Amino acid sequence: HAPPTLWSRVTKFGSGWGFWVSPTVFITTTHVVPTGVKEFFGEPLSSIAIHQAGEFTQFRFSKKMRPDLTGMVLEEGCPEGTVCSVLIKRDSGELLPLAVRMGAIASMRIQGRLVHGQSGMLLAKGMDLGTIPGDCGAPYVHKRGNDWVVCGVHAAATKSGNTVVCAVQA
Numbered sequence: 191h192a193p194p195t196l197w198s199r200v201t202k203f204g205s206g207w208g209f210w211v212s213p214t215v216f217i218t219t220t221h222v223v224p225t226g227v228k229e230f231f232g233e234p235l236s237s238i239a240i241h242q243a244g245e246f247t248q249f250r251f252s253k254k255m256r257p258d259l260t261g262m263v264l265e266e267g268c269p270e271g272t273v274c275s276v277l278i279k280r281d282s283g284e285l286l287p288l289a290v291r292m293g294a295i296a297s298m299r300i301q302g303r304l305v306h307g308q309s310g311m312l313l314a315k316g317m318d319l320g321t322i323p324g325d326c327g328a329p330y331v332h333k334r335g336n337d338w339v340v341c342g343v344h345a346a347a348t349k350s351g352n353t354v355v356c357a358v359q360a
Protein backbone atom coordinates (compact mmCIF):
# COMPACT_ATOMS: atom_id res chain seq x y z
CA HIS A 191 0.00 0.00 0.00
CA ALA A 192 2.04 2.93 -1.29
CA PRO A 193 1.46 6.05 0.83
CA PRO A 194 0.51 9.45 -0.63
CA THR A 195 4.04 10.84 -0.44
CA LEU A 196 5.41 7.91 -2.47
CA TRP A 197 2.78 8.50 -5.14
CA SER A 198 3.70 12.20 -5.07
CA ARG A 199 7.09 11.16 -6.49
CA VAL A 200 5.41 9.96 -9.70
CA THR A 201 5.63 12.90 -12.08
CA LYS A 202 4.44 13.67 -15.59
CA PHE A 203 7.45 13.72 -17.91
CA GLY A 204 7.72 13.78 -21.69
CA SER A 205 5.50 11.14 -23.27
CA GLY A 206 5.28 9.24 -19.97
CA TRP A 207 6.30 9.53 -16.31
CA GLY A 208 9.30 9.66 -14.07
CA PHE A 209 10.01 9.22 -10.38
CA TRP A 210 11.81 11.31 -7.75
CA VAL A 211 14.13 8.96 -5.86
CA SER A 212 15.39 11.92 -3.82
CA PRO A 213 15.24 15.74 -3.89
CA THR A 214 17.80 15.69 -6.72
CA VAL A 215 17.55 12.25 -8.37
CA PHE A 216 14.88 11.55 -11.02
CA ILE A 217 14.52 8.30 -12.98
CA THR A 218 12.54 7.53 -16.10
CA THR A 219 12.39 5.32 -19.18
CA THR A 220 14.77 6.45 -21.89
CA HIS A 221 12.28 6.40 -24.77
CA VAL A 222 9.96 8.90 -23.04
CA VAL A 223 12.69 11.50 -22.38
CA PRO A 224 12.17 14.70 -24.43
CA THR A 225 14.77 15.38 -27.10
CA GLY A 226 16.06 18.72 -28.34
CA VAL A 227 15.48 20.67 -25.13
CA LYS A 228 17.93 22.87 -23.25
CA GLU A 229 16.32 22.36 -19.81
CA PHE A 230 14.41 19.90 -17.64
CA PHE A 231 11.98 21.29 -15.06
CA GLY A 232 13.47 24.71 -15.82
CA GLU A 233 17.05 23.66 -15.01
CA PRO A 234 19.76 24.01 -17.66
CA LEU A 235 21.41 20.82 -18.86
CA SER A 236 24.74 22.23 -17.67
CA SER A 237 23.25 21.83 -14.18
CA ILE A 238 22.20 18.17 -14.60
CA ALA A 239 24.24 14.96 -14.52
CA ILE A 240 22.71 12.43 -16.94
CA HIS A 241 23.33 8.69 -16.55
CA GLN A 242 21.76 6.48 -19.19
CA ALA A 243 22.05 2.69 -19.50
CA GLY A 244 19.76 1.31 -22.20
CA GLU A 245 16.13 2.13 -21.41
CA PHE A 246 16.98 3.40 -17.89
CA THR A 247 17.72 7.13 -17.53
CA GLN A 248 18.78 8.86 -14.33
CA PHE A 249 19.09 12.60 -13.76
CA ARG A 250 20.92 14.19 -10.85
CA PHE A 251 20.10 17.88 -10.45
CA SER A 252 22.36 20.43 -8.78
CA LYS A 253 19.33 22.20 -7.31
CA LYS A 254 17.08 20.48 -4.80
CA MET A 255 13.93 20.03 -7.00
CA ARG A 256 11.81 18.10 -4.45
CA PRO A 257 13.22 19.21 -1.09
CA ASP A 258 10.08 17.82 0.63
CA LEU A 259 11.31 14.29 -0.11
CA THR A 260 13.73 11.95 1.59
CA GLY A 261 16.05 9.65 -0.27
CA MET A 262 15.04 6.07 -0.80
CA VAL A 263 16.60 2.76 -1.81
CA LEU A 264 17.20 2.33 -5.55
CA GLU A 265 18.20 -1.18 -6.64
CA GLU A 266 19.07 -2.73 -10.00
CA GLY A 267 15.99 -4.87 -10.38
CA CYS A 268 14.68 -7.31 -7.86
CA PRO A 269 14.93 -11.05 -7.21
CA GLU A 270 12.74 -13.31 -9.31
CA GLY A 271 9.54 -14.00 -7.39
CA THR A 272 9.29 -10.51 -5.91
CA VAL A 273 5.78 -9.05 -6.00
CA CYS A 274 6.16 -5.37 -6.85
CA SER A 275 3.63 -2.56 -7.22
CA VAL A 276 3.67 -0.54 -10.43
CA LEU A 277 2.60 2.98 -9.42
CA ILE A 278 0.58 3.86 -12.48
CA LYS A 279 -0.82 7.38 -12.69
CA ARG A 280 -3.33 8.17 -15.44
CA ASP A 281 -3.93 11.65 -16.85
CA SER A 282 -7.44 11.75 -15.31
CA GLY A 283 -5.64 11.58 -11.95
CA GLU A 284 -6.76 8.02 -11.27
CA LEU A 285 -4.23 5.83 -9.46
CA LEU A 286 -3.83 2.20 -10.55
CA PRO A 287 -1.34 0.31 -8.34
CA LEU A 288 -0.69 -2.87 -10.31
CA ALA A 289 0.60 -5.93 -8.45
CA VAL A 290 3.16 -7.85 -10.49
CA ARG A 291 5.30 -10.91 -9.73
CA MET A 292 8.70 -10.13 -11.22
CA GLY A 293 10.56 -12.80 -13.32
CA ALA A 294 14.16 -12.81 -14.43
CA ILE A 295 16.43 -9.92 -15.37
CA ALA A 296 17.43 -10.33 -19.00
CA SER A 297 18.06 -8.74 -22.37
CA MET A 298 14.73 -8.84 -24.20
CA ARG A 299 13.75 -8.19 -27.80
CA ILE A 300 11.17 -5.39 -27.79
CA GLN A 301 9.95 -3.63 -30.96
CA GLY A 302 13.23 -4.71 -32.54
CA ARG A 303 15.61 -3.41 -29.85
CA LEU A 304 17.58 -5.36 -27.26
CA VAL A 305 16.65 -4.01 -23.82
CA HIS A 306 18.10 -4.92 -20.44
CA GLY A 307 15.26 -5.22 -17.97
CA GLN A 308 12.94 -7.46 -16.04
CA SER A 309 9.67 -9.09 -16.99
CA GLY A 310 6.75 -9.57 -14.63
CA MET A 311 3.35 -11.23 -14.62
CA LEU A 312 0.29 -9.27 -13.54
CA LEU A 313 -1.63 -10.92 -10.74
CA ALA A 314 -5.89 -8.40 -18.09
CA LYS A 315 -6.91 -6.31 -21.10
CA GLY A 316 -10.52 -7.49 -20.99
CA MET A 317 -10.64 -6.68 -17.28
CA ASP A 318 -8.90 -3.31 -17.90
CA LEU A 319 -6.28 -4.24 -15.31
CA GLY A 320 -3.24 -3.70 -17.55
CA THR A 321 -0.80 -1.02 -18.66
CA ILE A 322 -1.42 1.16 -21.70
CA PRO A 323 0.45 3.67 -23.89
CA GLY A 324 1.54 6.64 -21.82
CA ASP A 325 2.31 4.61 -18.68
CA CYS A 326 6.04 4.32 -19.37
CA GLY A 327 8.33 5.59 -16.63
CA ALA A 328 6.01 4.53 -13.82
CA PRO A 329 8.06 3.06 -10.96
CA TYR A 330 8.22 -0.57 -9.87
CA VAL A 331 8.40 -0.61 -6.06
CA HIS A 332 8.23 -2.91 -3.04
CA LYS A 333 8.67 -2.47 0.70
CA ARG A 334 11.40 -4.27 2.68
CA GLY A 335 10.87 -3.80 6.40
CA ASN A 336 10.74 -0.04 6.95
CA ASP A 337 12.39 0.73 3.58
CA TRP A 338 10.58 1.52 0.34
CA VAL A 339 12.61 0.30 -2.66
CA VAL A 340 12.34 1.35 -6.30
CA CYS A 341 13.87 -1.15 -8.73
CA GLY A 342 12.69 -0.38 -12.27
CA VAL A 343 10.72 1.90 -14.59
CA HIS A 344 7.88 0.73 -16.82
CA ALA A 345 8.93 0.17 -20.43
CA ALA A 346 6.65 -2.32 -22.22
CA ALA A 347 3.89 -4.93 -22.01
CA THR A 348 2.45 -7.85 -23.97
CA LYS A 349 -0.61 -7.73 -26.21
CA SER A 350 -2.40 -9.58 -23.40
CA GLY A 351 -1.13 -7.10 -20.82
CA ASN A 352 -0.61 -10.00 -18.42
CA THR A 353 3.18 -9.63 -18.83
CA VAL A 354 4.96 -6.29 -18.34
CA VAL A 355 8.61 -5.22 -18.57
CA CYS A 356 10.52 -2.64 -16.55
CA ALA A 357 13.88 -1.13 -17.46
CA VAL A 358 16.49 -1.72 -14.78
CA GLN A 359 19.61 0.25 -14.03
CA ALA A 360 23.01 -1.10 -15.06
Ligand SMILES: *[C@@H](O)[C@H](C[C@@H]1CCNC1=O)NC(=O)[C@H](CC1CCCCC1)NC(=O)OCC(C)(C)c1cccc(Cl)c1
Pocket residue numbers: 206221222245299300301303305321322323324325326327344345346347348349353354355
Ligand atom coordinates in the same frame (compact mmCIF):
# COMPACT_ATOMS: atom_id res chain seq x y z
C1 LIG B 1 5.18 3.21 -22.76
O1 LIG B 1 5.80 4.08 -23.69
C2 LIG B 1 4.65 1.98 -23.51
C3 LIG B 1 3.83 1.11 -22.57
C4 LIG B 1 3.27 -0.12 -23.28
C5 LIG B 1 2.49 0.26 -24.53
C6 LIG B 1 1.40 -0.82 -24.66
N1 LIG B 1 1.16 -1.29 -23.32
C7 LIG B 1 2.31 -0.84 -22.45
O2 LIG B 1 2.42 -1.08 -21.29
N2 LIG B 1 5.83 1.25 -23.98
C8 LIG B 1 5.95 0.80 -25.35
O3 LIG B 1 5.08 1.01 -26.15
C9 LIG B 1 7.22 0.04 -25.79
C10 LIG B 1 8.19 1.02 -26.41
C11 LIG B 1 9.56 0.39 -26.72
C12 LIG B 1 10.34 1.39 -27.57
C13 LIG B 1 11.82 1.08 -27.75
C14 LIG B 1 12.54 0.46 -26.55
C15 LIG B 1 11.72 -0.42 -25.62
C16 LIG B 1 10.28 0.05 -25.42
N3 LIG B 1 6.79 -0.94 -26.76
C17 LIG B 1 6.02 -2.10 -26.37
O4 LIG B 1 5.59 -2.23 -25.27
O5 LIG B 1 5.81 -3.08 -27.36
C18 LIG B 1 4.54 -3.67 -27.38
C19 LIG B 1 4.68 -4.93 -28.24
C20 LIG B 1 3.37 -5.71 -28.25
C21 LIG B 1 5.03 -4.50 -29.67
C22 LIG B 1 5.79 -5.78 -27.63
C23 LIG B 1 6.75 -6.39 -28.42
C24 LIG B 1 7.75 -7.16 -27.82
C25 LIG B 1 7.77 -7.32 -26.44
C26 LIG B 1 6.81 -6.71 -25.65
CL1 LIG B 1 6.83 -6.89 -23.87
C27 LIG B 1 5.82 -5.95 -26.25
